[PDB]
């Protein structure tokens, strides 16, 4: 009642769109989605409210494990009990399970409190101090990201013994409140007129139209007559396509493009021929067009919401029957496709078929063999499904039904095959559903790794109520970390009108399933809102006065009650495990770059040294490419680690949150190469030669025996970053966008240009880094060639996963990133990974590239 109303207003402020606007559309598809998804999400909320206490830890604090541990040494740990002022430090082994550490902690408590305890270690979980992170399960301590991280930095793990009753009180606190195949006539539409058309009066107006099944044409494109340029052009002409109404596939889309001719692009618009209830569309349609930047089949199938300014093409869909006509039900489809001729071929053609199914464009005769032998593709080459789907004639209902019959008894495919099938090249809904079925086996860790791409896929969907939305919602409601990033990936695109309805509707549905998480995300939004206002202040102030003056005023503004309250005690949007507790106003500042990004520091007494975390708030730039590049660098690190190779990478968080707005994770104890190379006097790193500065800095940060492992960290990370930047074509690399951690770890920042952006980016070897790798010596081939080996190993591991990078980048094309919009961009990846060559041919080629980069480094070594 009063709560229903509050939650509704809270969801509205959270998603950045009033719920009343969904009702105002009076759209039955929108109303059905809201009803269906609200129900689906409320069932997940009820399922969760009754979860066991370990299951509720699996939901809220999913395990953060080392990639090499998915599916021996002395260790010092500090353990306290919940709300106890006293802790206990004790030696454990890296091979010990959390349970042994717990039994240890419980025996200590029994002896200090002089009483034999009722408690068993099974009734407890271990929280990482001041973090929404927990250690539980039968995994050795070294398998946990937190422990493993503490071991490299030499830090002592700090853990809190949390009872099951405490966890069950968290679960209770966070509770939700109380017949077409008959119609043989050619496809046709009436092109009535246009409205609000703005163009050069010297020219004429033409409407190009085409029927598509994804990006493939179903027939040849057709064009209207040339009508004189005016605000309201009138055609009233029938456009006739070469394709029977019975041949129209379920996912057929009618695409329009309006242009001015003497070409000159003005606008475009698409629509689905069948609705969400499978009915073949009849009557008049007003298409509110999107301004063009020749047809756009990949474009959205919903009209431009800016009705007041947008051009509108009025069309008529004919009543080809006196009663409604729905697309045949699956039972009628299987009944038609059931009957086929099983292909029988020679042993010679059997080797030729094997050759092409294991080989990727084909010749016509090669496509006919695949289609002839489709039954054998199902039985002996099921991973060749995508190649089979590409030869299927989508403009012939008899061929489509035969394809669908084989697909409905097709064995589930590996995750890598299923990711390829979500591409827009496979637009059929049954293929789409099959691809989601083979993706249900994804682990939460795999799903997390590919979520950004699966959210981009939502922009290729033709209808709101889809298998991918239910799958993303179900997985979001089952894992709080998936939930968090699903929300932010959707929320960050609400300023984009083509997606605002889809995205707003999914977030509302999500909020229905988690009232508590909605309130938690609102706290995140309240902090971001304040940051925007604070950053606006800084942008204006930085142009009018000195930096000490702007920094002081920034501080006074932060010191206001409203600011101190909104900016404190929130989960980080960059990582929900990270708690941003007390903002340290004195340690906050801003950068000197164009957008004057804010540098916000936090502290947490409960987390200790681990609670000292920073975020960078940046407003003015599109942060989506930075996020993608960094996610690709993190994926590389995961693949390398799975082959036992740790190149000591720094894939720091980067998250868009709003319109040209986002956060970047601060890596503390790091400085740019440019700052270190300044070679300021009265510093511990002051050098005799500028080439010594970076090694002297490493020396002051790592005294005595520590220097040796810092040079190794630098070498390892340098090899990984040399490989990452080359493979991804990261260019415009200089001293101010390369950083170094005190540990020796090198890392890259500011990924605004990738995939060659257009020039093939050569491999880069910088003399200042070769100097450190060589331990400051002129000649140190032992050290240098050990670095080349790290580079080669890293490169050949990525190649073996080349299809994964290709599949994920192809899915990203949906995002609309200016540097990832066609085949030219994916070609850079195919080239840089040398995927068309053998491992020997590719490795030899990488060596030609690495050697060319060494001779280039020698042009600076000569001086
Ligand atoms: C278009 O200009 C690109 C640069 S930007 O700043 O505008 N934006 C940006 C910043 C960062 C990034 C990330 C990290 C760090 C970092 O350091 C920059 C300073 C910070 N300095 C301390 C002294 O007070 C602040 C020390 C010297 O380096 C920067 C450190 O850990 C992670 C990444 N990407 C960016 O954009 C996409």
mmCIF file of N, CA and C and ligand atoms in Angstrom, residues 547 551 587-597 599 614 616-618 621-623 626-627 630 650 652-654 664-673 675 736-739 741 747-752, ligand 1:
data_model
loop_
_atom_site.group_PDB
_atom_site.id
_atom_site.type_symbol
_atom_site.label_atom_id
_atom_site.label_comp_id
_atom_site.label_asym_id
_atom_site.label_seq_id
_atom_site.Cartn_x
_atom_site.Cartn_y
_atom_site.Cartn_z
ATOM 1 N N UNK A 547 45.223 25.997 -8.303
ATOM 2 C CA UNK A 547 44.921 24.652 -7.841
ATOM 3 C C UNK A 547 44.836 24.586 -6.309
ATOM 4 N N UNK A 551 41.349 23.229 -4.728
ATOM 5 C CA UNK A 551 41.464 22.032 -3.903
ATOM 6 C C UNK A 551 40.870 22.323 -2.504
ATOM 7 N N UNK A 587 42.885 13.960 1.849
ATOM 8 C CA UNK A 587 43.597 13.206 0.823
ATOM 9 C C UNK A 587 42.904 13.263 -0.555
ATOM 10 N N UNK A 588 41.777 13.996 -0.694
ATOM 11 C CA UNK A 588 41.081 14.068 -1.979
ATOM 12 C C UNK A 588 41.640 15.221 -2.780
ATOM 13 N N UNK A 589 41.653 15.085 -4.113
ATOM 14 C CA UNK A 589 42.140 16.124 -5.024
ATOM 15 C C UNK A 589 41.486 15.904 -6.410
ATOM 16 N N UNK A 590 42.074 16.448 -7.474
ATOM 17 C CA UNK A 590 41.604 16.282 -8.837
ATOM 18 C C UNK A 590 42.826 16.340 -9.754
ATOM 19 N N UNK A 591 42.743 15.719 -10.961
ATOM 20 C CA UNK A 591 43.818 15.749 -11.966
ATOM 21 C C UNK A 591 43.726 16.980 -12.836
ATOM 22 N N UNK A 592 44.860 17.321 -13.471
ATOM 23 C CA UNK A 592 45.006 18.504 -14.319
ATOM 24 C C UNK A 592 44.517 18.325 -15.732
ATOM 25 N N UNK A 593 44.088 17.113 -16.113
ATOM 26 C CA UNK A 593 43.568 16.832 -17.452
ATOM 27 C C UNK A 593 42.208 17.535 -17.689
ATOM 28 N N UNK A 594 41.835 17.679 -18.976
ATOM 29 C CA UNK A 594 40.639 18.359 -19.487
ATOM 30 C C UNK A 594 39.376 18.256 -18.594
ATOM 31 N N UNK A 595 38.961 17.040 -18.274
ATOM 32 C CA UNK A 595 37.748 16.780 -17.502
ATOM 33 C C UNK A 595 37.927 16.936 -15.990
ATOM 34 N N UNK A 596 39.145 17.314 -15.540
ATOM 35 C CA UNK A 596 39.528 17.517 -14.125
ATOM 36 C C UNK A 596 38.971 16.375 -13.224
ATOM 37 N N UNK A 597 39.334 15.099 -13.511
ATOM 38 C CA UNK A 597 38.756 13.999 -12.738
ATOM 39 C C UNK A 597 39.090 14.076 -11.254
ATOM 40 N N UNK A 599 39.820 12.574 -7.437
ATOM 41 C CA UNK A 599 40.613 11.518 -6.806
ATOM 42 C C UNK A 599 40.044 11.486 -5.382
ATOM 43 N N UNK A 614 40.844 4.035 -2.949
ATOM 44 C CA UNK A 614 40.492 5.228 -3.701
ATOM 45 C C UNK A 614 39.723 4.901 -4.965
ATOM 46 N N UNK A 616 38.366 7.086 -8.760
ATOM 47 C CA UNK A 616 38.540 8.279 -9.581
ATOM 48 C C UNK A 616 37.203 8.446 -10.234
ATOM 49 N N UNK A 617 36.626 9.643 -10.125
ATOM 50 C CA UNK A 617 35.359 9.965 -10.759
ATOM 51 C C UNK A 617 35.687 10.839 -11.963
ATOM 52 N N UNK A 618 35.267 10.378 -13.144
ATOM 53 C CA UNK A 618 35.511 11.087 -14.392
ATOM 54 C C UNK A 618 34.232 11.343 -15.191
ATOM 55 N N UNK A 621 34.096 12.115 -20.589
ATOM 56 C CA UNK A 621 34.522 11.138 -21.601
ATOM 57 C C UNK A 621 33.685 9.851 -21.597
ATOM 58 N N UNK A 622 33.634 9.154 -22.734
ATOM 59 C CA UNK A 622 32.947 7.870 -22.842
ATOM 60 C C UNK A 622 33.953 6.873 -22.265
ATOM 61 N N UNK A 623 33.577 6.141 -21.181
ATOM 62 C CA UNK A 623 34.499 5.205 -20.534
ATOM 63 C C UNK A 623 34.322 3.708 -20.919
ATOM 64 N N UNK A 626 37.572 1.907 -22.363
ATOM 65 C CA UNK A 626 38.519 1.667 -21.267
ATOM 66 C C UNK A 626 38.112 0.435 -20.521
ATOM 67 N N UNK A 627 36.821 0.340 -20.168
ATOM 68 C CA UNK A 627 36.285 -0.836 -19.512
ATOM 69 C C UNK A 627 36.505 -2.093 -20.333
ATOM 70 N N UNK A 630 40.364 -3.077 -20.489
ATOM 71 C CA UNK A 630 40.777 -3.587 -19.181
ATOM 72 C C UNK A 630 40.216 -4.980 -18.849
ATOM 73 N N UNK A 650 47.845 -5.625 -13.705
ATOM 74 C CA UNK A 650 47.083 -4.676 -12.901
ATOM 75 C C UNK A 650 45.819 -4.271 -13.704
ATOM 76 N N UNK A 652 42.952 -2.898 -13.158
ATOM 77 C CA UNK A 652 42.229 -2.065 -12.188
ATOM 78 C C UNK A 652 40.800 -1.788 -12.715
ATOM 79 N N UNK A 653 39.839 -1.679 -11.803
ATOM 80 C CA UNK A 653 38.449 -1.417 -12.153
ATOM 81 C C UNK A 653 38.232 -0.151 -12.958
ATOM 82 N N UNK A 654 37.270 -0.209 -13.883
ATOM 83 C CA UNK A 654 36.784 0.911 -14.689
ATOM 84 C C UNK A 654 35.332 0.674 -15.004
ATOM 85 N N UNK A 664 37.028 4.874 -11.869
ATOM 86 C CA UNK A 664 38.257 4.143 -12.128
ATOM 87 C C UNK A 664 38.810 3.778 -10.739
ATOM 88 N N UNK A 665 39.294 2.548 -10.585
ATOM 89 C CA UNK A 665 39.886 2.099 -9.331
ATOM 90 C C UNK A 665 41.280 2.673 -9.195
ATOM 91 N N UNK A 666 41.568 3.258 -8.018
ATOM 92 C CA UNK A 666 42.894 3.805 -7.706
ATOM 93 C C UNK A 666 43.829 2.615 -7.295
ATOM 94 N N UNK A 667 45.029 2.590 -7.865
ATOM 95 C CA UNK A 667 46.068 1.645 -7.513
ATOM 96 C C UNK A 667 47.036 2.502 -6.687
ATOM 97 N N UNK A 668 47.063 2.273 -5.369
ATOM 98 C CA UNK A 668 47.899 3.050 -4.448
ATOM 99 C C UNK A 668 49.326 2.646 -4.583
ATOM 100 N N UNK A 669 50.282 3.521 -4.196
ATOM 101 C CA UNK A 669 51.720 3.240 -4.259
ATOM 102 C C UNK A 669 52.198 3.115 -5.709
ATOM 103 N N UNK A 670 51.615 3.930 -6.587
ATOM 104 C CA UNK A 670 51.956 3.941 -7.994
ATOM 105 C C UNK A 670 52.129 5.339 -8.488
ATOM 106 N N UNK A 671 53.009 5.484 -9.454
ATOM 107 C CA UNK A 671 53.361 6.764 -10.050
ATOM 108 C C UNK A 671 53.607 6.529 -11.529
ATOM 109 N N UNK A 672 53.448 7.574 -12.324
ATOM 110 C CA UNK A 672 53.660 7.504 -13.762
ATOM 111 C C UNK A 672 55.148 7.503 -14.021
ATOM 112 N N UNK A 673 55.563 6.899 -15.168
ATOM 113 C CA UNK A 673 56.954 6.921 -15.642
ATOM 114 C C UNK A 673 57.384 8.392 -15.770
ATOM 115 N N UNK A 675 56.481 11.062 -14.070
ATOM 116 C CA UNK A 675 56.829 11.610 -12.751
ATOM 117 C C UNK A 675 58.160 11.120 -12.237
ATOM 118 N N UNK A 736 53.362 9.385 -19.559
ATOM 119 C CA UNK A 736 52.310 9.805 -18.647
ATOM 120 C C UNK A 736 51.088 8.848 -18.641
ATOM 121 N N UNK A 737 51.096 7.826 -19.488
ATOM 122 C CA UNK A 737 49.993 6.873 -19.511
ATOM 123 C C UNK A 737 50.490 5.452 -19.225
ATOM 124 N N UNK A 738 51.720 5.373 -18.673
ATOM 125 C CA UNK A 738 52.381 4.149 -18.208
ATOM 126 C C UNK A 738 52.742 4.449 -16.757
ATOM 127 N N UNK A 739 52.383 3.516 -15.863
ATOM 128 C CA UNK A 739 52.589 3.608 -14.432
ATOM 129 C C UNK A 739 53.383 2.424 -13.909
ATOM 130 N N UNK A 741 54.088 0.425 -9.981
ATOM 131 C CA UNK A 741 53.786 0.198 -8.582
ATOM 132 C C UNK A 741 55.123 0.056 -7.836
ATOM 133 N N UNK A 747 52.219 -0.977 -15.401
ATOM 134 C CA UNK A 747 50.857 -1.074 -15.944
ATOM 135 C C UNK A 747 50.501 0.134 -16.800
ATOM 136 N N UNK A 748 49.524 -0.049 -17.680
ATOM 137 C CA UNK A 748 49.045 0.975 -18.603
ATOM 138 C C UNK A 748 47.709 1.578 -18.150
ATOM 139 N N UNK A 749 47.510 2.852 -18.450
ATOM 140 C CA UNK A 749 46.253 3.577 -18.199
ATOM 141 C C UNK A 749 45.802 4.248 -19.522
ATOM 142 N N UNK A 750 44.574 4.818 -19.548
ATOM 143 C CA UNK A 750 43.963 5.586 -20.631
ATOM 144 C C UNK A 750 43.928 4.850 -21.986
ATOM 145 N N UNK A 751 42.951 3.957 -22.144
ATOM 146 C CA UNK A 751 42.775 3.126 -23.334
ATOM 147 C C UNK A 751 41.729 3.665 -24.349
ATOM 148 N N UNK A 752 41.898 4.918 -24.745
ATOM 149 C CA UNK A 752 40.999 5.587 -25.691
ATOM 150 C C UNK A 752 41.141 5.162 -27.141
HETATM 151 C C1 LIG B 1 42.534 11.561 -20.692
HETATM 152 O O1 LIG B 1 43.517 11.560 -19.667
HETATM 153 C C2 LIG B 1 43.795 10.260 -19.190
HETATM 154 C C3 LIG B 1 44.327 10.455 -17.763
HETATM 155 S S1 LIG B 1 43.043 10.947 -16.634
HETATM 156 O O2 LIG B 1 43.628 11.108 -15.339
HETATM 157 O O3 LIG B 1 42.308 12.029 -17.215
HETATM 158 N N1 LIG B 1 41.980 9.734 -16.524
HETATM 159 C C4 LIG B 1 42.236 8.372 -16.225
HETATM 160 C C5 LIG B 1 42.938 7.999 -15.087
HETATM 161 C C6 LIG B 1 43.299 6.665 -14.912
HETATM 162 C C7 LIG B 1 44.223 6.289 -13.806
HETATM 163 C C8 LIG B 1 44.103 5.069 -13.123
HETATM 164 C C9 LIG B 1 44.902 4.792 -12.013
HETATM 165 C C10 LIG B 1 45.829 5.724 -11.591
HETATM 166 C C11 LIG B 1 45.965 6.928 -12.274
HETATM 167 O O4 LIG B 1 46.956 7.767 -11.814
HETATM 168 C C12 LIG B 1 47.076 9.089 -12.348
HETATM 169 C C13 LIG B 1 48.035 9.872 -11.486
HETATM 170 C C14 LIG B 1 47.668 9.882 -10.015
HETATM 171 N N2 LIG B 1 48.662 10.661 -9.254
HETATM 172 C C15 LIG B 1 48.283 10.902 -7.851
HETATM 173 C C16 LIG B 1 48.934 12.186 -7.267
HETATM 174 O O5 LIG B 1 47.639 12.602 -6.771
HETATM 175 C C17 LIG B 1 46.977 11.679 -7.671
HETATM 176 C C18 LIG B 1 49.987 10.042 -9.424
HETATM 177 C C19 LIG B 1 50.351 10.031 -10.886
HETATM 178 O O6 LIG B 1 49.349 9.337 -11.651
HETATM 179 C C20 LIG B 1 45.176 7.221 -13.368
HETATM 180 C C21 LIG B 1 46.566 5.168 -10.406
HETATM 181 O O7 LIG B 1 45.931 3.915 -10.129
HETATM 182 C C22 LIG B 1 44.980 3.585 -11.140
HETATM 183 C C23 LIG B 1 42.885 5.765 -15.890
HETATM 184 N N3 LIG B 1 42.174 6.100 -16.977
HETATM 185 C C24 LIG B 1 41.848 7.373 -17.126
HETATM 186 O O8 LIG B 1 41.039 7.784 -18.127
HETATM 187 C C25 LIG B 1 40.444 6.783 -18.948
#
